[PDB]
């Protein structure tokens, strides 16, 4: 029992983190086989980031301009190419600690673990979710660029995020491991607007189900609601629309607890209108939306 | 910027987790050098946990009754001894992945990362704190016993907790790596009450300091209070007393922010009585108390630890 923001073990990812330096700019790289992936803005200074032209800044660079350090063994760069917003540096040595891995692009609402790194050294691991506006509310300091987000599906490490930027409002943007940003963001220091951030409804319900599995039941009620009847209320409170797909996804949690999805939907709606009245659910005074239904299954059952 | 429940990188500890099976009971063990540490109740069945005598159940076992599996090597047990509530099994092979380690007993209020394990395979890592009532608010399922809690200095893993049981209120109890339980709990299926839990005051102040580092300053005021005057108000709200020691520990955060500890205490006093008035601090509507002053300093300063590339 008990419920925690649980991250995956970071060992398999620790063995892939390297330091990539270009000029006076240093950030982290992902070393899989004989390729090192890192944000392409490693070739920029601070003044450069105001309006960088990556076409030009890369043509001016050679293999010897990239200093890659794995621990403090220096990896020799033998090639370089740009794929969207990530730089791919081929080195002369394959990473002996490369795990079974896969490059995936996640949907908003899905969660993943982040291994925060500085100078290629691990600092901490934590869980977060891809917001509906394609930002993430992470913890990143200067030098953290190139840190990766990942899930471990059984034995395969699914890399899904590479950190690139901190926007002026404090949230963070990045790409998949093919270099395509999540959301409308670009690797330039400029005014960039995110979409309205909304709450991940299906995650709140999954988390409400985790609460009931853990003995928190005070928010259950006797009303019942439907699909259209739930969504008309949800979006006044900036909640994502709940689909029949979601209702199926919550099925296993419904069965484990014996409370139908539409019963639970009536409860949340109630919490939306009246508030929590000084009470708590799973140690929180807010409705948590960064646990997927799968996440609840791992902690309360086991995938 | 940003602030998160950050756990230590778990790589160095992942290489030490093994599966320990005795009879029909399977739980996790910690394999350091040629010794495997695990909870001693691996030798009990459900019928034995009602009122076990571990001296007896252990005398009726010998080395071949303990099956230890590391990955897909079967470790051969060549000795077994009991130290308080942990069982120590010597194996014929030293763990090649042993790091600097240390067995420490932590104080209530201190935090550590837990590597949740099942069948000797790590499943997840999360941060938590030793509650003042010597429980921990963990996340553990059946088979998780033997999971360990730890801190990392730089390359040294300080082991401080081994999981043993879930209390009926859903919280968890365990021992240090010498087998001594934290708190008044015992490894027998019996009536056990944890007791009233209090809020870790010095941790809340550390987290308030983290907030101001991150740009959240709305709770600051012009007042200062005295340790005695703050504690009179705090302890009416089920808060741990704040000592001169605590005030010292917060010194570095005070210097970094330019806010005296007793100034921050004046802010906390207000938040305790009036609430947050529909606002949030670091994305939370509650006062967080599971970040130590040290936890705030490294996360806000980006302290790193030794990776696997020597
Ligand atoms: O999160 C951030 O990303 C950039 C980069 O400098 C970090 O490597 C920055 O300034 C942050 O605060
Ligand atoms: O923490 C726990 O201890 C018991 C034990 O049966 C697991 O081995 C249990 O089910 C937990 O959740």
Curated annotation (Swiss-Prot), chain A:
Q: Which reaction does it catalyse?
A: TSAVLQ-|-SGFRK-NH2 and SGVTFQ-|-GKFKK the two peptides corresponding to the two self-cleavage sites of the SARS 3C-like proteinase are the two most reactive peptide substrates. The enzyme exhibits a strong preference for substrates containing Gln at P1 position and Leu at P2 position
The location annotated for the cross-link Glycyl lysine isopeptide (Lys-Gly) (interchain with G-Cter in ubiquitin) is 5, 90
The record gives the effect of mutating residue 145 to A as:
Complete loss of 3C-like proteinase nsp5 cleavage
Record-annotated Peptidase C30 domain positions: 1-303
**Could you tell me which residue ranges are on the Cytoplasmic side of the membrane?**
1-303
Per the record, what is the consequence of mutating residue 132 to H?
In strain: Omicron/BA.1, Omicron/BA.2, Omicron/BA.2.12.1, Omicron/BA.2.75, Omicron/BA.4, Omicron/BA.5, Omicron/BQ.1.1, Omicron/XBB.1.5, Omicron/EG.5.1
* Control of this protein's activity: Inhibited by pyridone-containing alpha-ketoamides compounds 13a and 13b. In turn, alpha-ketoamide 13b (tert-butyl (1-((S)-1-(((S)-4-(benzylamino)-3,4-dioxo-1-((S)-2-oxopyrrolidin-3-yl)butan-2-yl)amino)-3-cyclopropyl-1-oxopropan-2-yl)-2-oxo-1,2-dihydropyridin-3-yl)carbamate) inhibits SARS-CoV-2 replication in human lung cells. Inhibited ex vivo by michael acceptor inhibitor N3. Inhibited ex vivo by compound 11a and 11b.
What happens on changing residue 189 to A? Does not affect ability to cleave and inactivate human TRMT1
Subcellular location per the Swiss-Prot or TrEMBL entry: Host cytoplasm; Host Golgi apparatus; Host nucleus
Q: Which residues form the active site?
A: 41 (for 3cl-pro activity), 145 (nucleophile)
Role summary: Cleaves the C-terminus of replicase polyprotein at 11 sites. Recognizes substrates containing the core sequence [ILMVF]-Q-|-[SGACN]. Cleaves and inactivates human TRMT1, preventing tRNA guanine(26)-dimethylation of tRNAs. May cleave human NLRP1 in lung epithelial cells, thereby activating the NLRP1 inflammasome pathway. May cleave human GSDMD, triggering alternative GSDME-mediated epithelial cell death upon activation of the NLRP1 inflammasome, which may enhance the release interleukins 1B, 6, 16 and 18. Also able to bind an ADP-ribose-1''-phosphate (ADRP).
Q: How does it assemble?
A: 3CL-PRO exists as monomer and homodimer. Only the homodimer shows catalytic activity. Interacts with host FBXO22; this interaction promotes the proteasomal degradation of nsp5.
Protein's name according to its UniProt entry: 3C-like proteinase nsp5
